[PDB]
Amino acid sequence: DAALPSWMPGADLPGYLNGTLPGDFGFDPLYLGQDPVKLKWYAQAELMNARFAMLAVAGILVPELLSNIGFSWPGAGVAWYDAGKFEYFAPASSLFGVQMLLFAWVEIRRYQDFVKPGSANQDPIFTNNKLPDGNEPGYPGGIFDPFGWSKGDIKSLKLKEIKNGRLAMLAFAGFIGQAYTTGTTPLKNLSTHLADPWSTTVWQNDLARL
Amino acid sequence: MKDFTTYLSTAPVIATIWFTFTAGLLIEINRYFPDPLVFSF
Amino acid sequence: DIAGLTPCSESKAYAKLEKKELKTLEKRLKQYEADSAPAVALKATMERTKARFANYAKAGLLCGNDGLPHLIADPGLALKYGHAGEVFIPTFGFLYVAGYIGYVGRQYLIAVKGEAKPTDKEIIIDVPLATKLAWQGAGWPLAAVQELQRGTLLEKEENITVSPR
Amino acid sequence: RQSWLPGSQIPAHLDTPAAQALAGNFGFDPLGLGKDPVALRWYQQAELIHCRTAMAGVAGILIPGLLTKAGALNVPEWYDAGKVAIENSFAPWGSLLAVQLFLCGFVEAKRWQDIRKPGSQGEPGSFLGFEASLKGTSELGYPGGPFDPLGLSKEADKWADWKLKEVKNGRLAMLAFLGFVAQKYATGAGPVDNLAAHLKDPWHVNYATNGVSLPFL
Amino acid sequence: KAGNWLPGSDAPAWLPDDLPGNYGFDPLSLGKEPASLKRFTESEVIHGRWAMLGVAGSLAVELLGYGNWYDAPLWAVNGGKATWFGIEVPFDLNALLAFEFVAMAAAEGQRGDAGGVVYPGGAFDPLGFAKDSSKSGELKLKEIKNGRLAMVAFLGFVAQHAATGKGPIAALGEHLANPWGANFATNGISVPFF
Ligand code: CLA
Ligand code: CLA
Ligand code: CLA
Ligand SMILES: CC(/C=C/C=C(C)/C=C/[C@@]12O[C@]1(C)C[C@@H](O)CC2(C)C)=C\C=C\C=C(C)\C=C\C=C(C)\C=C\[C@@]12O[C@]1(C)C[C@@H](O)CC2(C)C
Ligand SMILES: CC(/C=C/C=C(C)/C=C/[C@@]12O[C@]1(C)C[C@@H](O)CC2(C)C)=C\C=C\C=C(C)\C=C\C=C(C)\C=C\[C@@]12O[C@]1(C)C[C@@H](O)CC2(C)C
């Protein structure tokens, strides 16, 4: 290893994590990323779960935030764990069908990029359009990077991405756990913790609940 | 006591021990499961 | 209703035999006091008798005109009318154990054939070897089939024979 | 070495190159059933078929069981589903079993003759061109081709671990089916309901506290 | 070689570029052997021609008002008096079944005794459109692509009927009346839980 950051200062890190991935702090106490093929898979899995969890915590909080602020949606005040029972123009059936067809397309595209990097950088129809060569799996760029980032700043930005994404994955785990234990919305849990933080610890609530 | 355990490994002693074991197993099976005319359990 | 045999739960001679045995036991029991050692013994014997009769009638056994349970040896009649636990199931139950014994003894013989004095390993048993083989003889049917298919269960014409073949 | 008993003397027939290539070789052969290499090959095939069949069946037991405990389905218990499915069916269970035995005997006889001679069902002219795709692969029990749509066996990097995952999940699922059977015979409830009853009171709801497993206790 | 079927996936080496309809789609590697591949090349065109005719018929029987493809054979059962374009035909099930056996036996035996023949010019090419030329290759590609589309479409007929119970045009009208409330996801068959 080296003088890189570490999840535990002084700990003898495993070594196969040597900074080349974003957010490398040596945390692999179960040695799940020991084999480089499993590590190449888990890097992309981390990126994907991370980005989807970031989107999810955004779409759970900022609706909750906009509703507690007092804006008007048809879908305001409906909990994130109750938005499926909500009625829309289509039943959830057709929504899952369309979702899975479209995601089959784009996820098989992403998987073709992962299997053979540099392959899915081209449109079916408009071949004038393409993604810039030299990209990595998980970081397509081009039309996925339209606002003009990735020129410099890229290691800083990848570290930022994976840090916010780990935080968001933990936040979604917390949404699930808090909605299963407290049975309420997450920002209302924040409000009940900020009301009196000393009588609303998880220890306190879980002891009172049994 | 290598020679004593060689004696205990002799055909008559081993036969006595093994048949005491088999008979005791059958006797205990017939005490705890008495009168087993048919396989029904 | 297999060979004119009535179930022991419906036969009256079976109940007659039960009450006869119990009458014998209680006529012996009348001689002793309330809780003597003989009284305890005879009450336990009566309980064993009642339990035995209940457990034979519960097992679907067929009875004759004498009220005694008759076993069905035929597979096909035992499996059609639920009498497989009489002779059919214990058949393979026995054959497993008998092939166990034979296979274990065979393996012991074959293992001690290699020693310099194989005869003194038969009057003085190699107990660790014997126990190893006794434990690993639980899979005797599979091992015997696989030794049969290799042609290594049988000896060829190296066995000895009398002069007129 | 990755043994089942770290201090055991592993049998010499499971330390051979021909046996250490087998998936999930932890030296477990206390009865010496695979001392014959041919028997070890045949029993490896038997282990694979049992493990895949048990994986499929135990999934079909506990996944719909979990989904009917969660309301997503109303599948009856696995010890009741045959009667329920045959009372809603187009066929008696006898004709069903006959068609099933014919269709399964065909493919299992093909698998049998491939075990007898590896790569023999690719004898040209046997099927209608499909025999080309029935040669199997270099490894017996891992046929590939039409049985491998996603092409996950064409790596030679994840292949050993794919094997290991298969055989380990399959041994686990075989144990799981044996447990379904024993738990039905000892409790009278479903496997997921057994899990629930154990998770609501583990220290008084287990095999030590039913009247079947330990009659002495 | 016309198309890739998976942009980036390099083509299998056993599928020749001169094969009409070659997109490199053999993930199961069924056509790795040349004789298997020849049989499959003939059978694909045969299945495709039969499926083109079958889809044309299932669409023409409903667009002209004589019911759907599934309910057409229920004159043999459920009574009698077969019809064609409304004209009732004097053949019961047994007579036309036997004549179909005889005629198709003669035809497909004449076809099988020819070995592998998939493009029999002459009596089957009277208007002279294919003479093993640029147009012939292009037309073979067109034929095999319309045949693959028609095979997919007949599989769709069967699945949509087994899920919905409607006809092809009836299901199309249902979908155009409610594209989001009437699709494969909204029936209680295709997707398991909903
Ligand atoms: C060959 C003729 C023959 C036959 C077939 C029988 C058969 C029987 N006799 Mg009769 N008997 C015979 C000769 C015979 N006997 C003779 C010659 C005598 C005079 C000595 C007697 C005197 C006699 C009496 C006095 C009694 C019997 C009884 C019985 C029953 C025994 C049931 C039992 O013990 O369950 C045992 C059940 C088992 C399952 C044991 C099988 C052995 C092992 C344990 C199985 C293996 C399990 C497992 C793999 C082991 C793992 C390893 C282990 C080390 C842990 C059975 C019907 C008894 C009875 O009730 O009859 C109705 C009884 O009371 N017999
Ligand atoms: C495949 C794994 C597996 C799992 C997870 C369970 C789980 C359970 N079993 Mg089942 N069971 C199994 C296999 C399994 N069993 C097998 C193979 C048998 C036949 C010997 C049984 C026979 C059995 C009976 C008779 C009963 C249970 C019961 C139970 C429950 C309480 C545990 C208990 O009493 O000890 C389980 C009993 C054993 C003898 C232990 C067998 C476990 C084997 C060796 C595999 C698991 C060991 C593994 C190293 C650690 C767990 C793996 C897990 C993380 C996947 C629990 C839900 C009880 C119940 O229904 O309570 C509500 C009960 O009465 N089980
Ligand atoms: C993203 C991190 C995160 C954050 C900020 C919170 C915040 C909160 N949680 Mg939640 N929670 C989380 C993750 C998180 N949780 C996860 C992953 C789980 C699953 C185990 C839970 C399960 C859970 C339950 C069951 C309950 C809470 C409750 C609470 C509240 C009171 C705190 C408490 O009692 O201790 C809870 C603390 C933990 C469970 C420890 C998790 C710590 C995470 C993994 C790392 C924290 C990051 C960093 C070191 C510190 C924060 C930095 C930054 C955010 C400022 C508070 C609003 C309680 C509530 O509703 O209050 C009213 C309550 O009953 N949480
Ligand atoms: C195939 C299998 C299970 C298949 C299950 C199926 C099809 C289930 C089907 C269904 O449930 C569904 C889906 C739905 C239901 O409605 C209908 C049915 C039909 C009921 C289990 C095998 C289960 C097989 C088991 C449990 C085998 C265990 C073997 C062991 C432990 C062997 C141990 C040893 O042999 C070794 C390994 C080495 C030796 O040296 C030492 C010893 C100890 C001898
Ligand atoms: C769908 C189909 C075949 C699909 C095959 C596929 C996807 C194969 C895929 C792959 O193999 C490849 C390519 C390469 C491999 O490496 C990968 C896989 C994936 C394995 C055939 C349909 C083939 C369909 C055919 C031949 C249909 C014929 C229809 C007829 C004759 C209809 C007749 C009628 O409808 C009328 C006219 C009037 C009615 O009243 C009466 C009737 C009789 C119902």
From Swiss-Prot, chain B:
This is Photosystem I reaction center subunit IX. Coiled coil: none annotated. It is a single-pass membrane protein. It comes from the Eukaryota. The keyword Chloroplast applies. The chain crosses the membrane at residues 7-27. GO terms for biological process: photosynthesis.
Swiss-Prot record, chain C:
The gene is PSAF. Keywords: Chloroplast, Photosynthesis, Photosystem I, Plastid, Thylakoid, Transit peptide. Probably participates in efficiency of electron transfer from plastocyanin to P700 (or cytochrome c553 in algae and cyanobacteria). This plastocyanin-docking protein contributes to the specific association of plastocyanin to PSI. This is Photosystem I reaction center subunit III, chloroplastic. One of its GO terms (cellular component) is chloroplast thylakoid lumen. It comes from Chlamydomonas reinhardtii (Chlamydomonas smithii). The keyword Transferase does not apply. Its main location: plastid. It is found in: Plastid, Chloroplast thylakoid lumen. Belongs to the PsaF family. It comes from the Eukaryota. One of its GO terms (biological process) is photosynthesis.
